Design an enzyme around this catalytic site. Structure first.
Site: not given
Ligand SMILES: CC(C)c1[nH]nc2c(NCc3ccccc3-c3ccccc3)nc(SC3CCNCC3)nc12
Lengths: 256, 292
Positions: B16-17, B125, B13, B79
């Site tokens: 990071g992964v 964002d 996003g 979550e």
């Protein structure tokens, strides 16, 4: 109406992000004096790196909370202060200083490795809870209630706000919201003779009366400021930026 | 990290992964956000996302479940939701999103955003790729990596925040100050994008994005938006387009939806509608929680 909601949330949170009042008595190898030297340094560090005043108010909140739960020997106290200031810059700054510069300003007292590792420990101990209320977050809100806005009053209340950071005794026993009321009223009474306005007695629930204990400690601090061993805040608050208000005369009495 | 079984890589996003993973002891399905550390320490994106989401427990804001640090790794445990609002609008491109689900989805987003704002957090964002859906008809704000805790009143923060297409005009014009209206603009854009299943303002440069806005809402003047013509990146050379009539901008949309979208896309940020006020708008008198 999201403004009143924030004031309420901050008042809830400033009670939970509070350090234990007499935590320094349980610190075997450090004292209030050692703390007040580290805080005064972090001011000097703020100025060189042109960090926000909030960055500094947050770093001290992080230091105090960390020392409320961890024993620190004196040779490690500047590393806690360095790591906290790097954490606070990462949170609050547009352009946080790089680690290798926090190292430079310790004069290689500590390695990168040690600064990075204390940031992890500090995060662990504060459970990543870095979004703490500060004196400055209440000050800036209080300032919207001026009749009318006065740049000498703002810089003086900020100045006074910073003086509280240095001295754990007796400021640690006051909430940010309360210190910021003392600061505001004292700056206002000093510059314009006006007092804590009605609009803020309604907003905050704080009578001038309820601020009196803190306002009398902050008066003394103000008076005895030129003689205090830590002087970095008075130096910083001479620049024209702050309307050189650290050169003004404290009042002798408050007529309380 | 031994209790989690990787299932698939979900994607990337704002940083990071992200992995889909199962908790092997409880069976719970989670989204893991992996962050590598190399060499400035914990990214400010992570520090801000973790600290802010811990203070943002809401049903329309995705839940941070745990933070784990192993050697040179940081895992934020979240979550899981099987779908984002973007891919849902791609599937619904030909069909349409049912109006009551447009309404439920906008309602939920404003509830999640109002909570953020009242907890002194800008998202900065908001866009379909950061809004996640589940099967029970729930939508949730995700990716607070580019968020920030703001003050009263606001200082100057980062310029060129928000993905171009969803970026408010006061940013493009380089106002010293921006606050919560920036987040309302983005949801304005997303509201119309749900209605028409095409992006409202799909610019490729900062100037093109501005000119798309001006073509649609009209080039603002000192009457519409007092101060605009002496803002840093305002040029008096900019074309003066007149305001296009909304029944053309969002054809499917009733008088109440049009009234709200209008007020969510107000030029002057001080008069642009708040999340709380938006939630109380007549458009939301009759709102339900339908299913996708
Ligand atoms: C980290 C927390 C907030 C979280 N919780 N659920 C998440 C999730 N589910 C979505 C998904 C699941 C399983 C297979 C596929 C997808 C999927 C992938 C791409 C587009 C659409 C759907 N994805 C993401 S990552 C993001 C990548 C950039 N923008 C969109 C999704 N984070 C999730």
């Amino acid at each position: 109406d999201y403004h009143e909601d924030i004031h309420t949330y901050l008042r809830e949170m400033e009670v939970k992000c509070k350090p234990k009042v007499g935590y320094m008595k349980k610190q075997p190898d450090i004292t209030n004096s050692m703390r007040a030297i580290l805080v005064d340094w972090l001011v000097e560090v703020g100025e060189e790196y042109k960090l926000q005043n909030e960055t500094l108010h947050l770093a001290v909140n992080y230091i105090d909370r960390f020392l409320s739960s961890m024993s620190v020997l004196r040779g490690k106290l500047q590393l806690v202060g360095t790591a906290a200031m790097l954490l606070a810059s990462k949170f609050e700054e547009i352009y946080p200083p790089e680690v290798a510069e926090f190292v430079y300003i310790t004069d290689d007292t500590y390695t990168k490795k040690q600064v990075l590792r204390m940031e992890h420990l500090v995060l662990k101990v504060l459970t990543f809870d870095l979004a703490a209320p500060t004196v400055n977050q209440f000050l800036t809100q209080y300032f919207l209630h001026q009749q009318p806005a006065n740049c000498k009053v703002e810089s003086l209340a900020m100045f006074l706000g910073e003086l509280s950071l240095i001295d754990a005794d007796p400021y640690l026993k006051y909430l940010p919201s309360v210190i910021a009321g003392a600061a505001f009223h004292l700056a206002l009474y000093t510059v314009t003779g006006q007092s804590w306005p009605e609009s803020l007695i309604r907003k905050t629930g704080y009578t001038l009366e309820s601020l009196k204990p803190c306002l009398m400690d902050l008066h003394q601090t103000y008076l005895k400021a030129p003689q205090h061993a830590q002087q970095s805040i008075r130096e910083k608050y001479k620049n024209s930026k702050y309307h050189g208000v650290s050169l003004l005369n404290p009042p002798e009495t408050l007529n309380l | 990290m031994e209790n989690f079984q990787k299932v698939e890589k979900i994607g990337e996003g704002t940083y990071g992964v992200v992995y889909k993973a199962r908790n092997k002891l409880t069976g719970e399905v989670v989204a893991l956000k992996k962050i590598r550390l190399d060499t400035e320490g914990v990214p400010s994106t992570a520090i801000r996302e973790i600290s802010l989401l811990k203070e943002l427990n809401h049903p329309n804001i995705v839940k941070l479940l745990d933070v784990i640090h192993t050697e040179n790794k940081l895992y934020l445990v979240f979550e899981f939701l099987h779908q984002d609002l973007k891919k849902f609008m791609d599937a619904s491109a030909l069909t349409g999103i049912p109006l009551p689900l447009i309404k439920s989805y906008l309602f939920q987003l404003l509830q999640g955003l109002a909570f953020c704002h009242s907890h002194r957090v800008l998202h900065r964002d908001l866009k379909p790729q950061n809004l996640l859906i589940n099967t029970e008809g729930a939508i949730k704000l995700a990716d607070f990596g580019l968020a920030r805790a703001f003050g009263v009143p606001v200082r100057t923060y980062t310029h060129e925040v928000v993905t171009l297409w969803y970026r408010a005009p006061e940013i493009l014009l380089g106002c010293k100050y921006y606050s919560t209206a920036v987040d309302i603009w983005s949801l304005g854009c997303i509201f119309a994008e749900m209605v028409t299943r095409r992006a409202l303002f799909p610019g490729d440069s900062e100037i093109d994005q501005l000119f798309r806005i001006f073509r649609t809402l009209g080039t603002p003047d000192e009457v519409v938006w007092p101060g605009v013509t002496s803002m840093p990146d305002y040029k008096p050379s900019f074309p003066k387009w007149a305001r296009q009539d909304f029944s053309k901008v969002v054809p499917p949309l009733d008088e109440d939806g049009r009234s709200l979208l209008s007020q969510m896309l107000h030029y002057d940020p001080n008069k642009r509608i708040s999340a709380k006020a938006a939630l109380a708008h007549p458009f939301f008198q009759d709102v339900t929680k339908p299913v996708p």
